């Protein structure tokens, strides 16, 4: 009775969106409040069921947010790994805002899990070293959720949530159990050398051609093919005497060493996520349609702009039901994301904010310079490059002689010609200025 | 920004005076109709459409008490405050502005003090010196007409969007008698009244009348 | 002599690479001020910087120790696998003042089992480095500051081997700087307080080059000495800074410390000579910092050569087109030269640089709406420059999606107005 009710509550069954299974009872982080949490004196944030991108200028805490979300997901991970398991704690020396009279830090996240239990108000707190009073963590509901998950899984195989944190260090240079998918989930995941090792291993396991290892390899290969610019991926052993990885990077058939480093990092991240999600979703036609929360710090790290302009075209299409929390520096990726899925910081902020709001200006499908001019407050031209101001000064010169050419303006026009070139758009602008001002003077003269 | 002709004052203003009452206590709807009469459904200085109705005092209430409740200073602005340019920046981001230095758009013509370049920038009008020149920069600094990267990117993107318009209009000058061409320029300056940054598009299609 | 005409530029001129790591034959010219290499993500550019670092290692080895044999090429990696020659040469020319305008070097390596021991010809570079070492030993002379900084500098964070001069060359090449050595050296300088001016120079350096940081100091708490900065007005430790902030601080501080020990006799030890290689100067940076990295670097190091790779249009928008070196997308057909971009980049639109120098459209083609505006143009020109149902629907879609003030909508309005005036004047004419 009760067990069957719980199992039906977790094993949500609904497939009508062109065959794309969706969970009736979706787990996802609905809100997150930070109080005296390393800069943030008090900061609320909301999230979307599909995607949320946090942008800033290197001092606006973006990896702090992902770190906190990971340190609260660690408790779910721990309590799905053995009852009474301990999760990751806040640091008592760094993670509490230095400028605080309270001297303690709080991370009051809150998760929505299905229509029935619409709130899971967990909270992770720590006091500063030397404070007699010590703040507790309101982890009990997290324990309850992880415990129901673990118990129902033990009594019957259950698709568990997939939690991942792909931080910056996934690029720095550095087996058959399902819960191995939780290993290093909230840190140290998505390394490329780990990935090649694991997948040469998987290719060898199925080399005979007689969760199945073949299914896992095929699913992760399809993930690679579908959410990365490369179109094919194989392991070539049974040629060259060594085991090399080969892709179709840009229509070629090359080794993965020829791939760009950023492409390699993104490849490792995608493969790691696909492997984890096929490990944690055994009862599912497409394991990639599983739930979970994936954090990605600087999704565009080491990727050429041409790759940034395509990264996120396939994250959701291949991972529909997982909440992506990304942070990024690039506007080129923003030219593929709706304003609905974007939160931004305010430059010139002391840290005592109250909420991060979406961009009023639609960033999806917009020019990188416009969504870099308004969203991120970056001029299309460097203010430090005097040449960029030249055209402006040109105007002044014209207006200084009733919009007509003279010695100084002609000298500046010569400078523009010499610097920018003859096909330069700046030169076309300067010619337009000259013509307009000249015949404006002529109108002024004849009337 | 456009000229306004103020009309019959609401009686509620005569019922509230500095010290006796604050602005919050006034019924905004008791004054909204009159506003709609003088500026229609368009924002007074900073020139949104009034989908987000906003009442502002040109002079700050803090420094300038008493005249807060008077009909003369009640206008519209960019929107409901509940940012870094137009109205707000004067008290937060600016420094020690000295009141009368700044140009007030309801007695003095802004064109006599500042003009709009085709690069989206705004500079003091050519030939200004002394305190007349001082008013020009200080209106840029206090209102942060340039320093706000959102403003420079919108003024510039507006003029650059119609720069080919100025090319084709002016290049046809010789092909048509003056009386016909001036009519084309008249319609050209007619539509910029109902568009953002009218003065920016006014100085790109004609001059500031230096 | 004026310290042998040393205290005259000191920089690299040319680099030839023959059958070396996929470079069948590639000659590169380099600018005395700043060269930037683009086109690759850092595969061939890493090879170029690695070859330059191998070449500089000989200068370091001979300035440090007499007869020092700097790094040699490798018979296993630094030789093109498919080369009838069966040896790899890394030749490079240097320019050091009016006298000795061409100091050559070759690092050669032949496979095992070849008749002639294809051998590096490092005699002249060794001779110049020995001149440096000898004249320095006789009298103190500021010396070059070679360094290398690859993607390995993104790494988490002994008085004898941190305070003594010539420690500036320790692990100077090879990649990630020794920021831990800088931390210890700075704490030691603070304990001592000539050291005062060095401390001040480093402080001003990383305060000016790094936007976020505004101050740096150390608290001498009894039992634990901490290095603190004022990041966005917050007094924090280095462990608290973001990845990009601390990575760039480590780069600049390592470089500044090396220059301060190497250039004790300069009034501004940051203006000493050197050849600093920097892979991906844009690492972990945001557009606003990209738009000022090179300006700040060139400001704090007036007289020094930078060979830096990059893949960001904002970075190129601050560098003269002469300084740029484009790899072709079809590099498989090995090319003997790296031509500068035809278009000027300095002072230009980041969008134009991205579109032409890098072949990246201003709006992504994966988004359907991204094409909408352009389509509208064509449609307007299809119906004799007049609206029809399709163009009206497209205009409504643009207005709904991008907004009412949308730059796209304003440009659509301008296009329709221009076309209507076209038709009106055609009727009138
Ligand atoms: N304990 C603290 N007390 C006060 N301020 C802190 C504290 N910890 C961090 N800060 C602030 O947080 C900032 C760093 O936060 P964070 O690393 O998340 O920025 P980010 O650039 O968005 O992240 P990333 O680039 O790694 O993705 C520090 O520069 C510092 O100003």
mmCIF file of N, CA and C in Angstrom, chain A residues 360 370 373-375 377-380 391-392 395-396 399-400 429 431-433 435-436 439-440 442-443 446-447, chain B residues 115 117-119 123 126 149-150 152-154 156-157 163 166-167 170-171 173-174 178 181 203-207:
data_model
loop_
_atom_site.group_PDB
_atom_site.id
_atom_site.type_symbol
_atom_site.label_atom_id
_atom_site.label_comp_id
_atom_site.label_asym_id
_atom_site.label_seq_id
_atom_site.Cartn_x
_atom_site.Cartn_y
_atom_site.Cartn_z
ATOM 1 N N UNK A 360 16.026 42.755 -19.295
ATOM 2 C CA UNK A 360 14.850 43.290 -19.971
ATOM 3 C C UNK A 360 14.983 43.184 -21.483
ATOM 4 N N UNK A 370 25.357 44.063 -29.237
ATOM 5 C CA UNK A 370 24.249 44.693 -28.524
ATOM 6 C C UNK A 370 24.011 44.020 -27.179
ATOM 7 N N UNK A 373 26.665 45.169 -25.133
ATOM 8 C CA UNK A 373 26.649 46.596 -24.840
ATOM 9 C C UNK A 373 25.703 46.915 -23.692
ATOM 10 N N UNK A 374 24.573 46.218 -23.625
ATOM 11 C CA UNK A 374 23.537 46.480 -22.638
ATOM 12 C C UNK A 374 23.623 45.534 -21.447
ATOM 13 N N UNK A 375 23.661 44.226 -21.705
ATOM 14 C CA UNK A 375 23.663 43.249 -20.621
ATOM 15 C C UNK A 375 24.936 43.369 -19.792
ATOM 16 N N UNK A 377 27.505 45.815 -20.305
ATOM 17 C CA UNK A 377 28.055 47.166 -20.213
ATOM 18 C C UNK A 377 29.476 47.226 -20.775
ATOM 19 N N UNK A 378 29.635 46.750 -22.007
ATOM 20 C CA UNK A 378 30.921 46.749 -22.696
ATOM 21 C C UNK A 378 30.728 47.423 -24.047
ATOM 22 N N UNK A 379 31.468 48.503 -24.280
ATOM 23 C CA UNK A 379 31.327 49.248 -25.517
ATOM 24 C C UNK A 379 31.813 48.413 -26.702
ATOM 25 N N UNK A 380 31.209 48.582 -27.880
ATOM 26 C CA UNK A 380 31.733 47.888 -29.067
ATOM 27 C C UNK A 380 33.159 48.276 -29.404
ATOM 28 N N UNK A 391 36.601 59.042 -35.226
ATOM 29 C CA UNK A 391 35.400 59.445 -35.949
ATOM 30 C C UNK A 391 34.628 60.503 -35.175
ATOM 31 N N UNK A 392 34.447 60.290 -33.871
ATOM 32 C CA UNK A 392 33.727 61.274 -33.081
ATOM 33 C C UNK A 392 34.344 62.652 -33.201
ATOM 34 N N UNK A 395 33.478 64.574 -36.323
ATOM 35 C CA UNK A 395 32.239 65.343 -36.279
ATOM 36 C C UNK A 395 32.493 66.740 -35.742
ATOM 37 N N UNK A 396 33.133 66.834 -34.576
ATOM 38 C CA UNK A 396 33.379 68.145 -33.997
ATOM 39 C C UNK A 396 34.034 69.056 -35.021
ATOM 40 N N UNK A 399 31.615 70.353 -37.541
ATOM 41 C CA UNK A 399 30.719 71.335 -36.948
ATOM 42 C C UNK A 399 31.451 72.613 -36.573
ATOM 43 N N UNK A 400 32.774 72.556 -36.427
ATOM 44 C CA UNK A 400 33.540 73.744 -36.080
ATOM 45 C C UNK A 400 33.727 74.681 -37.262
ATOM 46 N N UNK A 429 31.832 55.616 -43.040
ATOM 47 C CA UNK A 429 31.175 56.543 -42.129
ATOM 48 C C UNK A 429 31.720 57.954 -42.304
ATOM 49 N N UNK A 431 33.151 59.357 -44.855
ATOM 50 C CA UNK A 431 32.683 59.924 -46.115
ATOM 51 C C UNK A 431 31.235 60.384 -45.998
ATOM 52 N N UNK A 432 30.395 59.578 -45.347
ATOM 53 C CA UNK A 432 29.004 59.971 -45.147
ATOM 54 C C UNK A 432 28.912 61.256 -44.333
ATOM 55 N N UNK A 433 29.700 61.347 -43.261
ATOM 56 C CA UNK A 433 29.769 62.570 -42.466
ATOM 57 C C UNK A 433 30.153 63.769 -43.325
ATOM 58 N N UNK A 435 29.920 64.264 -46.585
ATOM 59 C CA UNK A 435 28.882 64.629 -47.545
ATOM 60 C C UNK A 435 27.702 65.302 -46.849
ATOM 61 N N UNK A 436 27.230 64.706 -45.750
ATOM 62 C CA UNK A 436 26.070 65.244 -45.047
ATOM 63 C C UNK A 436 26.351 66.660 -44.577
ATOM 64 N N UNK A 439 26.654 69.327 -47.525
ATOM 65 C CA UNK A 439 25.414 69.790 -48.133
ATOM 66 C C UNK A 439 24.442 70.368 -47.105
ATOM 67 N N UNK A 440 24.631 70.086 -45.813
ATOM 68 C CA UNK A 440 23.936 70.858 -44.787
ATOM 69 C C UNK A 440 24.399 72.309 -44.800
ATOM 70 N N UNK A 442 25.513 73.769 -47.385
ATOM 71 C CA UNK A 442 24.992 74.341 -48.623
ATOM 72 C C UNK A 442 23.516 74.717 -48.486
ATOM 73 N N UNK A 443 22.720 73.905 -47.780
ATOM 74 C CA UNK A 443 21.344 74.313 -47.479
ATOM 75 C C UNK A 443 21.334 75.580 -46.635
ATOM 76 N N UNK A 446 22.001 78.665 -48.974
ATOM 77 C CA UNK A 446 20.993 79.050 -49.958
ATOM 78 C C UNK A 446 19.679 79.395 -49.268
ATOM 79 N N UNK A 447 19.691 79.466 -47.941
ATOM 80 C CA UNK A 447 18.491 79.811 -47.189
ATOM 81 C C UNK A 447 18.827 80.036 -45.719
ATOM 82 N N UNK B 115 24.644 69.517 -27.961
ATOM 83 C CA UNK B 115 24.236 68.919 -29.223
ATOM 84 C C UNK B 115 24.581 67.436 -29.223
ATOM 85 N N UNK B 117 25.996 64.194 -31.276
ATOM 86 C CA UNK B 117 26.824 63.738 -32.380
ATOM 87 C C UNK B 117 26.279 62.437 -32.960
ATOM 88 N N UNK B 118 26.682 62.152 -34.198
ATOM 89 C CA UNK B 118 26.247 60.932 -34.865
ATOM 90 C C UNK B 118 26.844 59.678 -34.241
ATOM 91 N N UNK B 119 27.861 59.816 -33.392
ATOM 92 C CA UNK B 119 28.434 58.685 -32.676
ATOM 93 C C UNK B 119 27.612 58.284 -31.461
ATOM 94 N N UNK B 123 27.831 66.423 -26.553
ATOM 95 C CA UNK B 123 28.908 67.329 -26.157
ATOM 96 C C UNK B 123 28.338 68.734 -26.032
ATOM 97 N N UNK B 126 28.958 74.044 -29.711
ATOM 98 C CA UNK B 126 30.139 74.767 -30.158
ATOM 99 C C UNK B 126 29.965 76.253 -29.879
ATOM 100 N N UNK B 149 26.535 53.460 -19.896
ATOM 101 C CA UNK B 149 26.795 52.715 -21.123
ATOM 102 C C UNK B 149 25.505 52.256 -21.784
ATOM 103 N N UNK B 150 24.432 52.093 -21.012
ATOM 104 C CA UNK B 150 23.149 51.732 -21.605
ATOM 105 C C UNK B 150 22.596 52.872 -22.452
ATOM 106 N N UNK B 152 24.450 55.417 -23.941
ATOM 107 C CA UNK B 152 25.282 55.613 -25.124
ATOM 108 C C UNK B 152 25.002 54.546 -26.172
ATOM 109 N N UNK B 153 24.699 53.323 -25.734
ATOM 110 C CA UNK B 153 24.410 52.255 -26.670
ATOM 111 C C UNK B 153 23.042 52.330 -27.306
ATOM 112 N N UNK B 154 22.117 53.080 -26.709
ATOM 113 C CA UNK B 154 20.785 53.236 -27.279
ATOM 114 C C UNK B 154 20.689 54.462 -28.178
ATOM 115 N N UNK B 156 23.252 55.807 -29.722
ATOM 116 C CA UNK B 156 24.056 55.478 -30.894
ATOM 117 C C UNK B 156 23.327 54.506 -31.810
ATOM 118 N N UNK B 157 22.701 53.476 -31.244
ATOM 119 C CA UNK B 157 22.004 52.495 -32.068
ATOM 120 C C UNK B 157 20.773 53.082 -32.744
ATOM 121 N N UNK B 163 20.789 56.612 -40.176
ATOM 122 C CA UNK B 163 21.788 57.384 -40.907
ATOM 123 C C UNK B 163 21.633 57.234 -42.413
ATOM 124 N N UNK B 166 19.129 59.740 -43.588
ATOM 125 C CA UNK B 166 19.621 61.095 -43.809
ATOM 126 C C UNK B 166 20.393 61.177 -45.118
ATOM 127 N N UNK B 167 21.072 60.096 -45.506
ATOM 128 C CA UNK B 167 21.798 60.091 -46.771
ATOM 129 C C UNK B 167 20.857 60.287 -47.949
ATOM 130 N N UNK B 170 18.923 63.818 -48.087
ATOM 131 C CA UNK B 170 19.729 64.983 -48.427
ATOM 132 C C UNK B 170 20.286 64.892 -49.843
ATOM 133 N N UNK B 171 20.614 63.685 -50.308
ATOM 134 C CA UNK B 171 21.218 63.533 -51.627
ATOM 135 C C UNK B 171 20.260 63.894 -52.754
ATOM 136 N N UNK B 173 18.548 66.566 -52.833
ATOM 137 C CA UNK B 173 18.283 67.990 -52.659
ATOM 138 C C UNK B 173 18.173 68.706 -54.000
ATOM 139 N N UNK B 174 19.155 68.507 -54.882
ATOM 140 C CA UNK B 174 19.161 69.218 -56.156
ATOM 141 C C UNK B 174 18.019 68.779 -57.063
ATOM 142 N N UNK B 178 13.172 73.706 -53.625
ATOM 143 C CA UNK B 178 13.355 73.828 -52.182
ATOM 144 C C UNK B 178 12.047 73.615 -51.431
ATOM 145 N N UNK B 181 11.444 69.872 -51.063
ATOM 146 C CA UNK B 181 12.399 69.203 -50.185
ATOM 147 C C UNK B 181 12.132 69.533 -48.724
ATOM 148 N N UNK B 203 19.291 66.413 -34.145
ATOM 149 C CA UNK B 203 20.589 66.959 -34.505
ATOM 150 C C UNK B 203 21.305 66.127 -35.559
ATOM 151 N N UNK B 204 20.787 64.946 -35.888
ATOM 152 C CA UNK B 204 21.349 64.133 -36.957
ATOM 153 C C UNK B 204 20.679 64.388 -38.297
ATOM 154 N N UNK B 205 19.459 64.920 -38.292
ATOM 155 C CA UNK B 205 18.743 65.244 -39.517
ATOM 156 C C UNK B 205 18.773 66.735 -39.815
ATOM 157 N N UNK B 206 19.016 67.558 -38.798
ATOM 158 C CA UNK B 206 19.270 68.984 -38.943
ATOM 159 C C UNK B 206 20.309 69.368 -37.896
ATOM 160 N N UNK B 207 20.483 70.667 -37.683
ATOM 161 C CA UNK B 207 21.440 71.167 -36.713
ATOM 162 C C UNK B 207 20.729 71.543 -35.416
#
